[PDB]
Chain length 253, copies 4
Amino acid sequence: EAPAAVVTGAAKRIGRAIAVKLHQTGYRVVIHYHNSAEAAVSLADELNKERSNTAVVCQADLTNSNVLPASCEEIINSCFRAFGRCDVLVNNASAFYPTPLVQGKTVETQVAELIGTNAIAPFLLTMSFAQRQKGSSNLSIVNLCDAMVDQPCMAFSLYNMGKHALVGLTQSAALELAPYGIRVNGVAPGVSLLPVAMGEEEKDKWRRKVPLGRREASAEQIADAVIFLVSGSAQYITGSIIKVDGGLSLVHA
Amino acid sequence: EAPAAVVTGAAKRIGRAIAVKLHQTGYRVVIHYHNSAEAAVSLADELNKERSNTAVVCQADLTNSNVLPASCEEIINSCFRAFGRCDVLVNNASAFYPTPLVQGGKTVETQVAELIGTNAIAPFLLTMSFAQRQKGTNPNCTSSNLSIVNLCDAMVDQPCMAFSLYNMGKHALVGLTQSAALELAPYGIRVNGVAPGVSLLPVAMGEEEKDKWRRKVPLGRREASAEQIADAVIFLVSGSAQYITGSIIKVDGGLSLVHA
Amino acid sequence: EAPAAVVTGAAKRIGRAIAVKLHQTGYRVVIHYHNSAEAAVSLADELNKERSNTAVVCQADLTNSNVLPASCEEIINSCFRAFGRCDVLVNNASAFYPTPLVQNGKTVETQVAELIGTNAIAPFLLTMSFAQRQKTSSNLSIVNLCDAMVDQPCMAFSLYNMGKHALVGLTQSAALELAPYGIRVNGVAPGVSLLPVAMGEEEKDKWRRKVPLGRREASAEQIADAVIFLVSGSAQYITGSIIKVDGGLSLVHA
Amino acid sequence: EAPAAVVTGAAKRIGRAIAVKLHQTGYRVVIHYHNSAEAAVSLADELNKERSNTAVVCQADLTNSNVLPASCEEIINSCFRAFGRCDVLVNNASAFYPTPLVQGDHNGKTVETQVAELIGTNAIAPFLLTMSFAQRQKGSSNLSIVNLCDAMVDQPCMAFSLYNMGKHALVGLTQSAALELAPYGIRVNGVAPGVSLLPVAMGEEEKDKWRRKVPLGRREASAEQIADAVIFLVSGSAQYITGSIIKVDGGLSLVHA
Ligand SMILES: NC(=O)c1ccc[n+]([C@@H]2O[C@H](COP(=O)([O-])OP(=O)(O)OC[C@H]3O[C@@H](n4cnc5c(N)ncnc54)[C@H](OP(=O)(O)O)[C@@H]3O)[C@@H](O)[C@H]2O)c1
Ligand SMILES: NC(=O)c1ccc[n+]([C@@H]2O[C@H](COP(=O)([O-])OP(=O)(O)OC[C@H]3O[C@@H](n4cnc5c(N)ncnc54)[C@H](OP(=O)(O)O)[C@@H]3O)[C@@H](O)[C@H]2O)c1
Ligand SMILES: NC(=O)c1ccc[n+]([C@@H]2O[C@H](COP(=O)([O-])OP(=O)(O)OC[C@H]3O[C@@H](n4cnc5c(N)ncnc54)[C@H](OP(=O)(O)O)[C@@H]3O)[C@@H](O)[C@H]2O)c1
Ligand SMILES: NC(=O)c1ccc[n+]([C@@H]2O[C@H](COP(=O)([O-])OP(=O)(O)OC[C@H]3O[C@@H](n4cnc5c(N)ncnc54)[C@H](OP(=O)(O)O)[C@@H]3O)[C@@H](O)[C@H]2O)c1
Ligand SMILES: CN(Cc1cnc2nc(N)nc(N)c2n1)c1ccc(C(=O)N[C@@H](CCC(=O)O)C(=O)O)cc1
Ligand SMILES: CN(Cc1cnc2nc(N)nc(N)c2n1)c1ccc(C(=O)N[C@@H](CCC(=O)O)C(=O)O)cc1
Ligand SMILES: CN(Cc1cnc2nc(N)nc(N)c2n1)c1ccc(C(=O)N[C@@H](CCC(=O)O)C(=O)O)cc1
Ligand SMILES: CN(Cc1cnc2nc(N)nc(N)c2n1)c1ccc(C(=O)N[C@@H](CCC(=O)O)C(=O)O)cc1
Ligand code: NI
Ligand code: NI
């Protein structure tokens, strides 16, 4: 019988590429989304046309709040309701914008969004993932990290704190959930898909920097590393974070 | 004119020892505390005994909440109020307890607020407020020695079982240390960390459990005293570390190097 | 047409498993060996029985010496003479033994030659020679076998540890320098894998216990699995990456 | 009694500033050099004019060879012979030049000479000096080793693989020796410059290119700023510190591509 996966922020871009590749591997998928309702059901439609009743949609804000644990518990619950199991969780959804230290949203909202999406939701989703299993199988969690986590971008401190917290969770959860046969790993893109709204010349500045090919990783290239980690080929791998960055983190100033 | 320093969680233990050594080095200090009012003022009394009006006290919960940015601004303000300047910020205050991922007291969101608030968010807001006050300073046109020192954890990559939120908070602190170091370098504000392995064990910990942790330590088979942690802090704030920023010094007696 | 791979120290254990999985994936293989002649040819015979003319054997000492560069050029040339190409280099051969700092009559300089040569310098020269011969339907890459415990070193293994650290450095330097040629350079870092046969089971179990995921060592095959991912089309953007295959061992404090 | 230190490659630049600061702190010093004889003897003279009988010179090639262990043993011996003790070893001497992985147009040296020089000076010599240092220990004291590492070690410069391998191996040694020598109270630490003193031969525009990369001040570290971290690590304010490598790089290693 088919395994099931939750992918967060799976409506488009890298999240969509992960849901799609997991689907092609034979997973049924919960496509989580926040604001991209149309893209999410459009994705689910295609996947369901491929194989009937193998994709459901689930919407949630993953900003930190007192109700976030409930939302995260529900996200996991939706996978079991639809599919009777939950074998894989991919923590992909992520708020991303600058927060300059020296001077719209209050700083506490930015805290809740940036740290919530990048670290607290992954933590809570991990708790619920594990709780639902215990209290053959190839259970694992993949966290979407950042290969530049130690060469941060200017004025992105909260985002960077969130990705760093995600490294800690990946390692803490790997260690703690190993007795249950739940493996916990990361995939760390460097420059992948640039923002839809980024000007082309700004995109080119980033591409130029990549030693391997002078270009960004495609969403499929990121998804490949994810499906390796969920596979039987990675049965012994846990607490490992795989850079998919084309050498970018190795390039000095 | 003597420089001034803010030290969070400075009433006891490592924070206290940092405050004492900064004061002995010539700093005026803001002693921040949460619950330890008695210890905070008795420290201030002692420092003020040595040099009149060189130690002041400041109370604040550093748990994340919608009033944290305000609280942290006021902490930095208290240093300018008392001493007319703020040269050094030491982020030492820290909540610390287990938070198991699997279950068989506080809600998990209270734990998040406390653990990531004290260890990461408050340091970040204090860093903002510290830097905002140095906005109109050109490091070329001045002879100051501004820095922040973040109290980290040498075991961040070999974490203790069931301490995931604490660990996330310390990881975020490493991220802030590095991000702030880069972003504030144009202001001549250096941002560094000191990472104890096993230092002062909890007062409530059984003596046999204490000795288990002590035995792990290759250099001397003992915990670091609070003074030895403070030595590294004062090096990092000193003129002999003027080119150091984004560095996290381990003070762990080799502990992080020991395999399972 | 079929790609070709060189695997150093390929007669036994992890190296043999890598050579086998590469061959199963469609690679022709050069099976390098040092002292394990019989094992090397029995492996070569087994793979050639599977598919004719897909396996050859190559003897070489990878200790550092004045002749080492020539040996390494010959190992690479060997793959080209046998198969007309060389798509993959796996640096697997490794000397491994204690060298205490404070006090088998091996001199320390022999220990240096053996431990640094096999783990670092031979990898570096094979990399030179590999790159030199390549100086686009191609997928060229190098995989170096590292050590997940490189920053939590075992007691009295300083030269070995220096060897492995130099290999990390080589992986990163070569990844950057060879990227313009489309040559990707990566690492697989076992923690506890195959234990020495002669080691007491009671000592083996001490190591096994340390491992969170399963309380067991990695099989050679599980290590080989990460190797074949790195060389595959599913890793075309991965260079300078070292993947731990350690079942969480490196995350366990003392 | 005054303590004693050995500093390798101490005739000039960073190694000199370390020898000077250790001398100013009250150490007697062995000034090791390879080619810089005049600068070495000139330093010994300045130090001796300040406090008589507190500085000696010792010449040795630290290229890897079958005689390197003897040479390193000699270097350590020279400290016990002059000063009756050896409290501090500073591994500073370092060969530094590109070794491209791909050749095209044919340099000077053979690749095995380059191996012997680059990894001998940066790694093997430090290892043997560490062996001899710990072996010779006699029996209030503060024994330590400081290794000069490199902050850019995981963001290597183009075509410097052998140099980078040496420096990576030196990290390994720092950590391994920290663990292994801890039971004897010998601490082993590192100082990692990013951009400090630029090569004399380097053109001014190239020098300015490196300087402008540094976030903290847009300048290189002086030799004295590097020596400061060294002297902190050998000091009593660092007695619980072992296996730590402190970056002195003005934030350079934190700058993305
Ligand atoms: N793209 C890159 O070059 C790159 C580089 C480094 C690291 N990464 C990591 O790789 C992963 C995917 O990258 P990406 O560029 O594809 O990410 P992205 O497009 O910026 O974001 C992915 C999804 O996250 C969801 N999200 C944002 N805020 C949310 C919130 N408040 N609550 C719930 N969901 C929220 C959004 O869902 P909706 O659209 O439905 O609202 C969004 O589509 C991320 O974790 C990222 O940090 C990517
Ligand atoms: N001790 C060790 O072995 C060790 C190991 C690794 C890292 N560290 C780091 O070194 C630093 C000092 O360690 P330590 O053991 O001295 O710390 P600690 O005793 O556990 O706590 C330090 C102080 O932090 C303050 N604090 C706690 N929760 C707070 C909150 N909600 N709001 C405001 N302040 C709060 C407390 O102040 P009040 O008493 O006034 O309430 C406390 O006295 C910490 O950052 C720690 O993480 C220590
Ligand atoms: N096994 C583990 O638990 C583990 C853990 C961490 C890292 N690793 C790494 O993974 C790789 C494979 O490990 P392993 O246990 O399979 O290795 P191994 O059995 O110790 O050695 C593999 C081969 O290296 C060859 N070799 C040794 N010295 C040589 C020299 N002088 N010149 C040429 N070849 C030489 C030997 O070839 P011959 O038999 O032909 O003489 C040997 O069969 C190694 O690089 C190792 O460091 C393994
Ligand atoms: N920007 C920087 O300068 C920088 C950056 C990162 C790391 N570092 C590290 O910091 C340390 C000091 O840097 P530096 O620039 O002052 O070094 P350097 O001037 O390039 O070299 C220091 C000394 O090493 C000695 N040496 C070279 N080859 C030798 C050999 N074959 N045998 C014995 N001695 C040999 C030379 O001594 P003689 O002159 O007597 O021949 C030289 O004076 C080095 O380890 C370096 O790698 C420096
Ligand atoms: C590598 N990358 C692509 C990119 C796109 N989406 C992402 N989304 C998430 N959640 N996380 C990522 N790290 C991410 N990265 C980058 C890198 C820098 C900037 C950047 O400098 N952003 C500025 C300026 C962008 C602009 O000029 O358009 C900003 O204010 O957002 C954006 C994307
Ligand atoms: C190294 N150390 C000392 C210690 C003391 N106070 C601190 N305080 C803070 N804020 N941060 C630290 N990391 C810290 N560390 C440790 C290490 C382990 C445990 C620990 O396993 N504690 C268990 C129980 C241990 C027990 O008391 O028996 C707990 O539930 O708190 C406590 C302190
Ligand atoms: C994880 N591992 C397995 C192992 C086997 N072969 C290898 N071979 C190589 N080349 N590299 C390795 N890292 C390696 N590792 C280990 C770990 C420790 C000891 C060990 O403590 N050996 C001591 C003790 C031997 C014993 O007690 O039986 C020795 O003196 O060799 C051996 C193998
Ligand atoms: C940071 N730095 C200064 C410098 C000077 N001496 C040293 N000496 C040693 N032993 N180790 C160092 N790391 C070192 N670094 C650098 C950085 C890059 C180049 C460099 O790109 N060198 C090229 C280009 C020289 C040029 O164009 O002038 C070479 O071929 O040597 C030189 C020095
Ligand atoms: Ni981190
Ligand atoms: Ni290394």
